[PDB]
Design an enzyme around this catalytic site. Structure first.
Site, PDB file in Angstrom:
ATOM      1  N   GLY A  13     -11.674  -9.301   3.431  1.00 29.89           N
ATOM      2  CA  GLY A  13     -12.286  -8.842   2.186  1.00 29.89           C
ATOM      3  C   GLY A  13     -11.471  -7.798   1.415  1.00 29.89           C
ATOM      4  O   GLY A  13     -11.838  -7.409   0.292  1.00 29.89           O
TER       5      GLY A  13
ATOM      6  N   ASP B 125       2.184 -14.808  -1.842  1.00 26.20           N
ATOM      7  CA  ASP B 125       0.777 -14.527  -2.070  1.00 26.20           C
ATOM      8  C   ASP B 125       0.583 -13.361  -3.056  1.00 26.20           C
ATOM      9  O   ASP B 125       0.268 -12.228  -2.688  1.00 26.20           O
ATOM     10  CB  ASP B 125       0.062 -14.347  -0.725  1.00 26.20           C
ATOM     11  CG  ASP B 125      -1.445 -14.213  -0.768  1.00 26.20           C
ATOM     12  OD1 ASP B 125      -2.057 -14.603  -1.793  1.00 26.20           O
ATOM     13  OD2 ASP B 125      -2.004 -13.683   0.194  1.00 26.20           O
TER      14      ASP B 125
ATOM     15  N   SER C   3      -8.151  -8.428   0.820  1.00 31.28           N
ATOM     16  CA  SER C   3      -7.126  -9.276   0.180  1.00 31.28           C
ATOM     17  C   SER C   3      -6.943  -8.944  -1.284  1.00 31.28           C
ATOM     18  O   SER C   3      -7.926  -8.762  -1.987  1.00 31.28           O
ATOM     19  CB  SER C   3      -7.513 -10.745   0.280  1.00 31.28           C
ATOM     20  OG  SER C   3      -7.570 -11.182   1.627  1.00 31.28           O
ATOM     21  N   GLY C   4      -5.696  -8.851  -1.727  1.00 29.15           N
ATOM     22  CA  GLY C   4      -5.389  -8.573  -3.125  1.00 29.15           C
ATOM     23  C   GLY C   4      -5.304  -7.105  -3.464  1.00 29.15           C
ATOM     24  O   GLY C   4      -4.857  -6.736  -4.549  1.00 29.15           O
TER      25      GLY C   4
ATOM     26  N   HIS D  34      -4.028 -16.221  -2.932  1.00 24.66           N
ATOM     27  CA  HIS D  34      -4.988 -16.906  -2.074  1.00 24.66           C
ATOM     28  C   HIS D  34      -6.452 -16.642  -2.468  1.00 24.66           C
ATOM     29  O   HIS D  34      -7.307 -17.467  -2.165  1.00 24.66           O
ATOM     30  CB  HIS D  34      -4.708 -16.638  -0.581  1.00 24.66           C
ATOM     31  CG  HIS D  34      -5.351 -15.412  -0.012  1.00 24.66           C
ATOM     32  ND1 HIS D  34      -4.594 -14.320   0.395  1.00 24.66           N
ATOM     33  CD2 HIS D  34      -6.657 -15.166   0.258  1.00 24.66           C
ATOM     34  CE1 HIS D  34      -5.458 -13.440   0.856  1.00 24.66           C
ATOM     35  NE2 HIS D  34      -6.718 -13.902   0.785  1.00 24.66           N
TER      36      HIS D  34
END
Ligand SMILES: O=C1NCCc2ccc(Cl)cc21
Ligand SMILES: [Ca+2]
Lengths: 55, 250
Positions: free
Chosen positions: B186, B90, B188-189, B41
Site C-alpha cells: 500500500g 516501475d 507503492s508509488g 504498477h
C-alpha cells in the site's frame, strides 16, 4: 572538477573548459556570491520542511 | 510501512495520496505544483481513468482538517519499457489538471539532476520511505501517515545478502533482512527521500519485494536517477487526449 566532492557545490555542479567550475541550484533557489551555496528565492522551496524550518 | 513511526503532521509535505473512486490506491511524490511521480504498477488494473484523484497535505485519513488539497489527475505517463504485471521500469509521471497551492503542509520534493543523484545522493546511506500502506504483511493499512528510515545497498551486496525477479540497473535495494522494517504494498508509488546539505531529494519510488518485512529480503525501489531526462522532457510537453500515455524510454 565536479567529480570530486560535487565540486564544493551544495546542489548542482557543472564542469567547464579548464579548471572552471559553475555551481547551480534547483529552481526556487539562487546561487550565493560564495558561488557554492543555494538560497531559497521562494516561500516554499522544494525539499525543505516549513514546520521544521520555522522552528 | 512496517516497523516505522507516524510522520508528524507536515514533516512529509511532499507525500501524495492517490485515490480511485474515493478508495486508497497508492502513494506519490509532489515534485512541483503540477507534477507527481508514482509507480507504473499502480495503474495496472485501472478502468475508471477519469476518477483518479491526488490528495496533497494529507495526514490522517479519518478526519478532514482543512490542509488537504485534491486534484484530478489529467494524465498518467508510463515508460514504453514497462510491462504490466512486472517489476522493471516501475515509474509513472502524473499531470494534475490544476496546480496545488504550496503551504506549510504542501511542499514538493526536489527532483535532482542525474549526475548529482548518481555521484552524490546514491552514496547517502539512509533515506526516508513513507505511506499509508499496511503496518504488517497481511495486516491493516495505516490511518496516519507513516515514515521509515532505511539504508541503501549496492545491488551486489543486496544479491549476496538475499536468501524471484532480478534487481536491474533501474532498481536499488534498501531496508533490512531481519523482518522488522520495510515499506509495504500500500506504500507503492511513494517516496524514497534523500537528505543532502539541508535539502531533501527524490531518489527512489516504493516498488516491490517478496512480501513485506520478509526475513532474508529487502525492499526494492525504482532508481529515479535513470529517469531524470525522461521526466524533464515530459514535463515540457503539452498534454494529450486520454489519461494514459505510453512515452518512449529512453
Ligand atoms: O513486499 C514488499 N516488500 C518490499 C517493499 C514492497 C513495496 C511494494 C510492494 Cl507491492 C511490496 C513490497
Ligand atoms: Ca485528513
Amino acid at each position: 572538477i565536479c567529480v570530486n566532492e560535487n565540486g564544493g557545490c551544495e546542489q548542482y555542479c557543472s564542469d567547464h573548459t579548464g579548471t572552471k567550475r559553475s555551481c547551480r541550484c534547483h529552481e526556487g533557489y539562487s546561487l550565493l556570491a560564495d558561488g557554492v551555496s543555494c538560497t531559497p528565492t521562494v516561500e516554499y522551496p522544494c525539499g525543505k520542511i516549513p514546520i521544521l524550518e520555522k522552528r | 510501512i512496517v516497523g516505522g513511526k507516524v510522520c508528524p503532521k507536515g514533516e512529509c509535505p511532499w507525500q501524495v495520496l492517490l485515490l480511485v473512486n474515493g478508495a486508497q490506491l497508492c502513494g506519490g511524490t509532489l515534485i512541483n505544483t503540477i507534477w507527481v511521480v508514482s509507480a507504473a504498477h499502480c495503474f495496472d488494473k485501472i478502468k475508471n481513468w477519469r476518477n483518479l484523484i491526488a490528495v496533497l497535505g494529507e495526514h490522517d485519513l479519518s478526519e478532514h482538517d482543512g490542509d488537504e488539497q485534491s486534484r484530478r489527475v489529467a494524465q498518467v505517463i508510463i515508460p514504453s519499457t514497462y510491462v504490466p504485471g512486472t517489476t522493471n521500469h516501475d515509474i509513472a509521471l502524473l499531470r494534475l489538471h490544476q496546480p496545488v497551492v504550496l503551504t506549510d503542509h504542501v511542499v514538493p520534493l526536489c527532483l535532482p539532476e542525474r549526475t548529482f543523484s548518481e555521484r552524490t545522493l546514491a552514496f547517502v546511506r539512509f533515506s526516508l520511505v513513507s505511506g499509508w500502506g499496511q503496518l504488517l504483511d497481511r495486516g491493516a493499512t495505516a490511518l496516519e501517515l507513516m515514515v521509515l528510515n532505511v539504508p541503501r545497498l549496492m545491488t551486489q551486496d543486496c544479491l549476496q545478502q538475499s536468501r524471484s525477479p532480478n534487481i536491474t540497473e533501474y532498481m536499488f535495494c534498501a531496508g533490512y533482512s531481519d523482518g522488522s522494517k520495510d515499506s509495504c504494498k500500500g506504500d507503492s508509488g511513494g517516496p524514497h527521500a534523500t537528505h543532502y546539505r539541508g535539502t531533501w531529494y527524490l531518489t527512489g519510488i516504493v516498488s516491490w519485494g517478496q512480501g513485506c518485512a520478509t526475513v532474508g529480503h529487502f525492499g526494492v525501489y525504482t532508481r529515479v536517477s535513470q529517469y531524470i531526462e525522461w521526466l524533464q522532457k515530459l514535463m515540457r510537453s503539452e498534454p494529450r487526449p486520454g489519461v494514459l500515455l505510453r512515452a518512449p524510454f529512453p
